[PDB]
Amino acid sequence: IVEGSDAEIGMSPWQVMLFRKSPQELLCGASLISDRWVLTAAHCLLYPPWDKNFTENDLLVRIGKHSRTRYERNIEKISMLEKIYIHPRYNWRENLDRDIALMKLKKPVAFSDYIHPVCLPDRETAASLLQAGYKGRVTGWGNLKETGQPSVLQVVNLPIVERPVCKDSTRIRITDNMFCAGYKPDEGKRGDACEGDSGGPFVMKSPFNNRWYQMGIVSWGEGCDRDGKYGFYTHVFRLKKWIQKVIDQF
Amino acid sequence: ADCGLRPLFEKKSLEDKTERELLESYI
Amino acid sequence: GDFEEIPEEYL
Ligand SMILES: CCc1c(N2CC[C@H](O)C2=O)cccc1S(=O)(=O)N[C@@H](CNC(=O)c1ccc(Cl)s1)C(=O)OCCc1nccn1C
Ligand SMILES: *[C@@H]1O[C@H](CO)[C@@H](O)[C@H](O)[C@H]1NC(C)=O
Numbered sequence: 001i002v003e004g005s006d007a008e009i010g011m012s013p014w015q016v017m018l019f020r021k022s023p024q025e026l027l028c029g030a031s032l033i034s035d036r037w038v039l040t041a042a043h044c045l046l047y048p049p050w051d052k053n054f055t056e057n058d059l060l061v062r063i064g065k066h067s068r069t070r071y072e073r074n075i076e077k078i079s080m081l082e083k084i085y086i087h088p089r090y091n092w093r094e095n096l097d098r099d100i101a102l103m104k105l106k107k108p109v110a111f112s113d114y115i116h117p118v119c120l121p122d123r124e125t126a127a128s129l130l131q132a133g134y135k136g137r138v139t140g141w142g143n144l145k146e147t148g149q150p151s152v153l154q155v156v157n158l159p160i161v162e163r164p165v166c167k168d169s170t171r172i173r174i175t176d177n178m179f180c181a182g183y184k185p186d187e188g189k190r191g192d193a194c195e196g197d198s199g200g201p202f203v204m205k206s207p208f209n210n211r212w213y214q215m216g217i218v219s220w221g222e223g224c225d226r227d228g229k230y231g232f233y234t235h236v237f238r239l240k241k242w243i244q245k246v247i248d249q250f
Numbered sequence: 251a252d253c254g255l256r257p258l259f260e261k262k263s264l265e266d267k268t269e270r271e272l273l274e275s276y277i
Numbered sequence: 278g279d280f281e282e283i284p285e286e287y288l
Contacts, residue, residue, distance in 0.1 A: 008258075009258060010256055011256070011259070024283075025280065060287060069279055078287040117254075119254035120253075135272045136272070159275060204272060205272050211253065
């Protein structure tokens with residue numbers, strides 16, 4: 001996260017770290033959606049152009065974390081993956097269209113002060129909150145700038161951007177399965193996600209029922225926090241039929 | 251049924267330092 | 278180098 005701040009304790013109890021066993025390292029963020037299911041970006045698990053194709057046994061999920069590097073004894077929980085499920089029409093060839101995956105955990109994680117699921121949006125909540133200018137919140141342990149790493153989880157609030165402004169910022173084809181967020185060049189505020197934040201959540205707090213909803217998944221950006229560029233997020237509501245089909249089946 | 255309500259915030263009626271920035275944008 | 282070693286049971 002670029003131009004964010006340190007998270008407060010238990011501020012994002014759904015935040016998940018995707019952790020490589022191999023060389024022990026941070027791969028991505030992710031989110032807890034129930035005691036057995038974690039949501040992330042497909043490109044955190046599969047990205048042929050960079051020879052990425054992880055299997056269940058390569059990875060752990062670390063839940064309840066605040067420190068990036070510390071083993072947070074009695075706070076974090078570390079979970080093994082039973083099964084990865086990648087959207088069958090994830091487009092890694094062109095523009096990361098449908099950048100979404102689920103991971104089923106071997107065992108249910110115990111909820112605590114630090115560990116608690118986020119809600120997934122219904123059509124009504126999506127229609128109300130996904131409006132240009134409404135702010136969401138992005139969290140992760142990725143780079144503090146495009147070209148340091150944080151001691152602790154970082155947070156930034158960013159406004160949703162009008163679709164034409166998103167399309168006009170980039171040569172990449174923007175789909176209805178994506179939305180963009182960030183400040184315009186001379187607004188006086190900035191900030192973005194960056195390398196290592198992808199797969200983490202873009203959340204909004206409903207003013208109707210005071211619950212947090214995951215509207216997006218950190219997907220991609222040109223660099224981090226560039227003037228005139230925006231961050232692109234997977235539109236979670238648009239892909240909720242697939243999410244429901246995977247959980248109902250498995 | 252308990253999704254999206256944080257033990258250290260909503261469940262205790264405590265606000266985090268920047269959530270009001272989100273509410274204020276929902277105009 | 279970077280990360281603290283996690284319990285040997287998770288590996
Ligand atoms: C041209 C953008 C890009 C692509 N993309 C995507 C569209 C097209 O398919 C393409 O080629 C692919 C790789 C790298 C980069 S990049 O190097 O210009 N930017 C990085 C760092 N910034 C951020 O992560 C963010 C900034 C704001 C938000 Cl929100 S995420 C990035 O997007 O990595 C995440 C994606 C990723 N990491 C490793 C593998 N993958 C797939
Ligand atoms: C990814 O790995 C799996 C298992 O090794 C394999 O079946 C699949 O073809 C690979 N996919 C790509 C796109 O390389």
